[PDB]
Amino acid sequence: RVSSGRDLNCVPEIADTLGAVAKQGFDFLCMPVFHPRFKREFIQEPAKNRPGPQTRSDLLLSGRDWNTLIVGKLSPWIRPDSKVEKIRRNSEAAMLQELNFGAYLGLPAFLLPLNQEDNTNLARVLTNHIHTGHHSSMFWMRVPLVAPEDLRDDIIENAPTTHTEEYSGEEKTWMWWHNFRTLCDYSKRIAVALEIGADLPSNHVIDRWLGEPIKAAILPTSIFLTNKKGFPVLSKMHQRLIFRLLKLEVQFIITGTNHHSEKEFCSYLQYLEYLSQNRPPPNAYELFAKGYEDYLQSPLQPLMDNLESQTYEVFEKDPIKYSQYQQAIYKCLLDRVPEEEKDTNVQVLMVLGAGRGPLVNASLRAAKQADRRIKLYAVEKNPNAVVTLENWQFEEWGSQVTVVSSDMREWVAPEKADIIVSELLGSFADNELSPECLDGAQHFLKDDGVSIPGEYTSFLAPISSSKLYNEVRACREKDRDPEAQFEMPYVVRLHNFHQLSAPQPCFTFSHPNRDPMIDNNRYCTLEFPVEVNTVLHGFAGYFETVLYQDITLSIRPETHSPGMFSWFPILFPIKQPITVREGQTICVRFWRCSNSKKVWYEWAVTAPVCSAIHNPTGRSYTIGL
Amino acid sequence: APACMERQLEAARYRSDGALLLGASSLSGRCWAGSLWLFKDPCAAPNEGFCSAGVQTEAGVADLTWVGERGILVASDSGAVELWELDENETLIVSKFCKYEHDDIVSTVSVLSSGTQAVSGSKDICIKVWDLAQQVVLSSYRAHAAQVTCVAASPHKDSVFLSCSEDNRILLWDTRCPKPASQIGGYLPTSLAWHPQQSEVFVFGDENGTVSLVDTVLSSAVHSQCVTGLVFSPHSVPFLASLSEDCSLAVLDSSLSELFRSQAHRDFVRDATWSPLNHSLLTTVGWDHQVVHHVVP
Numbered sequence: 012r013v014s015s016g017r018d019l020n021c022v023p024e025i026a027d028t029l030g031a032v033a034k035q036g037f038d039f040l041c042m043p044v045f046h047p048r049f050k051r052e053f054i055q056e057p058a059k060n061r062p063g064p065q066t067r068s069d070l071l072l073s074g075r076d077w078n079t080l081i082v083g084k085l086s087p088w089i090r091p092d093s094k095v096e097k098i099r100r101n102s103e104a105a106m107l108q109e110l111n112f113g114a115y116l117g118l119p120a121f122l123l124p125l126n127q128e129d130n131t132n133l134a135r136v137l138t139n140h141i142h143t144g145h146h147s148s149m150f151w152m153r154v155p156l157v158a159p160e161d162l163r164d165d166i167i168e169n170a171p172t173t174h175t176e177e178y179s180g181e182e183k184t185w186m187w188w189h190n191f192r193t194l195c196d197y198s199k200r201i202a203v204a205l206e207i208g209a210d211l212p213s214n215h216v217i218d219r220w221l222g223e224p225i226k227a228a229i230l231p232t233s234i235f236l237t238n239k240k241g242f243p244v245l246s247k248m249h250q251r252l253i254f255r256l257l258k259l260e261v262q263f264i265i266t267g268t269n270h271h272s273e274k275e276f277c278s279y280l281q282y283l284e285y286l287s288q289n290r291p292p293p294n295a296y297e298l299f300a301k302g303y304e305d306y307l308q309s310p311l312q313p314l315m316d317n318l319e320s321q322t323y324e325v326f327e328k329d330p331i332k333y334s335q336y337q338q339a340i341y342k343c344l345l346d347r348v349p350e351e352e353k354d355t356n357v358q359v360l361m362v363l364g365a366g367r368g369p370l371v372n373a374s375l376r377a378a379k380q381a382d383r384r385i386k387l388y389a390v391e392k393n394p395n396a397v398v399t400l401e402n403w404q405f406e407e408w409g410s411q412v413t414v415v416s417s418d419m420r421e422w423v424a425p426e427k428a429d430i431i432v433s434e435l436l437g438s439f440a441d442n443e444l445s446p447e448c449l450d451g452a453q454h455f456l457k458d459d460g461v462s463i464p465g466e467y468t469s470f471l472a473p474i475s476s477s478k479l480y481n482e483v484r485a486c487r488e489k490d491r492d493p494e495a496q497f498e499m500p501y502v503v504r505l506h507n508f509h510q511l512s513a514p515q516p517c518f519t520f521s522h523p524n525r526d527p528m529i530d531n532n533r534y535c536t537l538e539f540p541v542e543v544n545t546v547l548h549g550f551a552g553y554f555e556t557v558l559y560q561d562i563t564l565s566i567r568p569e570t571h572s573p574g575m576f577s578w579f580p581i582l583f584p585i586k587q588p589i590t591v592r593e594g595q596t597i598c599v600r601f602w603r604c605s606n607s608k609k610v611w612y613e614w615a616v617t618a619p620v621c622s623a624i625h626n627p628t629g630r631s632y633t634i635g636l
Numbered sequence: 637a638p639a640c641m642e643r644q645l646e647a648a649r650y651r652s653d654g655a656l657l658l659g660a661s662s663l664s665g666r667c668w669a670g671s672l673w674l675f676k677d678p679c680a681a682p683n684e685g686f687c688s689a690g691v692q693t694e695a696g697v698a699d700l701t702w703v704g705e706r707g708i709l710v711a712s713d714s715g716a717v718e719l720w721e722l723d724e725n726e727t728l729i730v731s732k733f734c735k736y737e738h739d740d741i742v743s744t745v746s747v748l749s750s751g752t753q754a755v756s757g758s759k760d761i762c763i764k765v766w767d768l769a770q771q772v773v774l775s776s777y778r779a780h781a782a783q784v785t786c787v788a789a790s791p792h793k794d795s796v797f798l799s800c801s802e803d804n805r806i807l808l809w810d811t812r813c814p815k816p817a818s819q820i821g822g823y824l825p826t827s828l829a830w831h832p833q834q835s836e837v838f839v840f841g842d843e844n845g846t847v848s849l850v851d852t853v854l855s856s857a858v859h860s861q862c863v864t865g866l867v868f869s870p871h872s873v874p875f876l877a878s879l880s881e882d883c884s885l886a887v888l889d890s891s892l893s894e895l896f897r898s899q900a901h902r903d904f905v906r907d908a909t910w911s912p913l914n915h916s917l918l919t920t921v922g923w924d925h926q927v928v929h930h931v932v933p
């Protein structure tokens with residue numbers, strides 16, 4: 012089910028054209044709202060007094076059709092950045108005229124070209140149009156992967172084409188888009204319509220558009236190969252790109268005329284459908300979080316807040332996660348109770364943060380498959396979840412489980428535990444204060460007691476994603492620091508983004524913490540080798556944790572526990588994007604700060620350039636103790 | 637044989653005996669189409685009813701040109717190059733072939749010396765050489781980096797032709813060469829016209845209203861807007877007619893000096909054609925639906 016559209020520059024009659032397009036299978040149509048050759052004068056007589064009508068009547072389509080089926084196109088003669096003043100003035104007025112008519116028709120999107128380097132005036136006029144009434148209409152900038160000048164035939168005898176590699180030169184079109192949207196101050200209504208050429212550029216050129224707000228991909232019919240049967244297809248390299256684009260759910264646009272005249276015109280479209288059907292579908296985890304991509308969420312604080320019912324339900328819908336806990340407990344029981352003592356040695360297990368009891372059941376299943384005896388304590392400070400635990404304990408568990416409605420840092424244990432089991436970790440490992448909780452519960456762990464998890468580590472990786480940068484930017488709230496949204500992390504299923512370097516370890520904690528001078532504050536410096544040109548927008552966060560020995564949990568991409576749904580990555584944004592050249596090193600600094608009340612993170616970028624220290628003194632974000 | 641004809645007149649070309657060819661486009665309103673017309677009585681045009689022949693096209697007529705004495709080659713908005721031919725009676729205009737080879741509006745078309753091949757330019761940035769007899773594209777060239785604004789065939793060399801584009805290139809073509817294109821040394825060029833009596837000489841106008849005389853430089857600021865077309869007269873020492881978007885027509889001499897000026901048009905002036913019968917009469921058409929007959933002194 013690909014959403015596709017037909018791009019035309021010639022519409023003799025709208026009603027007939029739209030019907031032929033829909034019958035061929037398209038979802039929408041890109042067409043000019045004024046005739047592409049109907050050049051218009053706005054200043055000099057007599058041509059400025061040309062009798063109307065200036066274009067088609069809006070009555071030729073229903074409001075619903077204009078709202079959902081038509082994409083406007085800027086007339087190609089409009090050149091707001093021309094070097095001839097008279098042409099600039101006319102283009103400005105003509106651009107406003109056409110854009111305003113598009114808004115008049117309620118069109119869902121309007122197509123404007125980025126076909127040269129200087130589109131400064133073009134951006135101003137657009138920006139002026141955007142700030143003329145608040146509307147949701149989108150503006151698709153038509154920009155090619157490869158500039159036409161860089162793909163022309165080498166047929167000019169006295170002007171040969173370049174044959175040497177120009178790394179930055181081959182990325183020029185991205186610079187066209189970057190400068191244009193920067194001039195427009197990252198307007199959420201301005202997106203990219205990436206146009207694909209017959210010959211693809213280097214991978215680094217294509218990767219440049221990772222994290223950019225690509226809404227449409229334009230496919231000229233002239234890039235289509237012909238197979239044996241006369242049908243149109245694509246090279247294996249182009250198919251590789253199409254698959255990458257389908258992961259971005261872009262809308263595909265077919266431009267040009269039918270060159271495979273032996274076949275009908277829905278053939279080009281039928282091939283896209285063919286490619287869409289051929290791919291690994293939602294593999295559980297991709298079916299799990301298909302609607303959560305690039306959706307910013309506030310990181311849970313299970314300590315400061317009492318989690319809702321359905322929040323625990325999400326925790327429990329992950330069997331692989333708890334079967335890893337079961338294994339970790341299983342191995343630990345065997346190592347602590349030799350076979351000859353399997354009937355006399357009862358191990359004191361304590362679930363610290365039992366929620367609704369998934370770890371309790373995991374501990375019970377572990378003792379059974381290990382053939383050992385355990386005495387369970389289920390500690391949970393959320394009194395609402397304690398309701399679930401005590402109904403469980405009465406109806407099923409029985410006397411074997413003792414539910415303790417208390418904070419593990421204050422609870423006065425009646426005895427000491429052989430094993431403490433806890434699931435206090437967030438996407439950034441310690442961002443829920445698992446170290447502080449386990450530190451306070453440490454007194455009632457036996458001298459030889461084991462903590463599960465035994466250690467966890469947080470990882471960071473610089474990422475580029477103008478899409479996510481914009482979403483964060485759009486999180487301004489009425490009565491707080493206007494930039495506080497950049498000084499706080501977000502849990503998100505990172506999707507449209509580009510990882511600029513390999514994740515490196517950030518913070519690590521071990522339990523039990525035998526050390527006599529416990530200090531959970533941290534200061535870490537990291538240097539990320541970047542081998543591309545890009546724009547830094549933030550740092551992704553992951554974590555690894557050791558439940559026991561070799562049994563582990565991880566959301567780090569290179570060591571991701573296969574099949575585990577829990578925990579999306581965390582995102583640490585930065586106020587201002589930072590340009591990074593190929594070969595430069597990104598130097599970031601992270602602090603874990605704390606007082607008696609709150610814990611928080613502060614981060615800063617020190618290379619290639621210095622950012623401001625983010626979230627100083629937790630002014631914008633704190634984690635409650 | 638249609639009653640009404642589109643408002644925006646785009647082309648007007650005389651043939652040997654003097655019959656006038658007209659190409660019109662509907663650039664506004666409900667239907668965006670085009671038509672072709674033949675006026676054996678030029679003074680009766682554009683009156684649709686007093687015409688010799690006429691026919692409607694599916695899309696607009698961006699440019700056209702005669703192919704012999706009964707052939708009409710059309711550059712369509714649809715991205716197609718069309719060839720129409722008059723019947724033996726010259727009362728019907730019939731489509732000969734309609735090939736969709738360009739991926740955007742076909743903006744310019746020109747017939748080569750032999751009269752058997754033509755060259756077309758389009759906004760798809762392509763230039764194509766056509767075999768009119770076989771109805772196929774012989775060669776497709778992507779030499780420019782922007783819209784192809786104009787292509788002009790050499791008057792007597794069947795492999796040579798000019799082309800200009802919004803990439804600010806003026807390209808001299810010679811398909812006899814391995815690399816057929818050659819860049820000729822400002823503001824964007826918009827119109828080309830070979831000299832009829834001098835092989836290696838041509839003139840070109842730019843978007844700023846300047847006309848330039850070039851050899852394989854002399855120039856004058858003729859217009860206040862884009863120079864749309866350039867047509868040499870059939871005289872031994874030919875005059876140069878230049879039309880522009882400033883709604884004016886100018887007639888220049890050998891040194892690009894102005895000898896005549898007409899502002900009869902109220903909209904853009906789109907074409908100019910000299911009468912083969914009366915060499916001092918010059919006909920112009922524009923988007924004001926006017927067909928003006930100028931008597932050039």
Ligand SMILES: CSC[C@H]1O[C@@H](n2cnc3c(N)ncnc32)[C@H](O)[C@@H]1O
Pocket residue numbers: 313314317318326363364365366390391392393396417418419420434435448
């Ligand atoms: C499964 S998410 C973490 C669980 O541990 C609980 N929890 C977090 N901190 C503490 C604490 N200090 N004492 C007891 N339970 C806790 C939380 O209420 C939540 O149910």
Ligand SMILES: Cn1cc(-c2ccc3c(=O)[nH]nc(C[NH3+])c3c2)cn1
Pocket residue numbers: 308309310311313325326327329434435436437438443502577578579
């Ligand atoms: C928005 N947001 C969601 C979480 C989350 C998701 C899954 C789990 C989980 O599966 N187990 N445990 C915990 C917390 N310790 C957890 C937290 C944290 N922030």
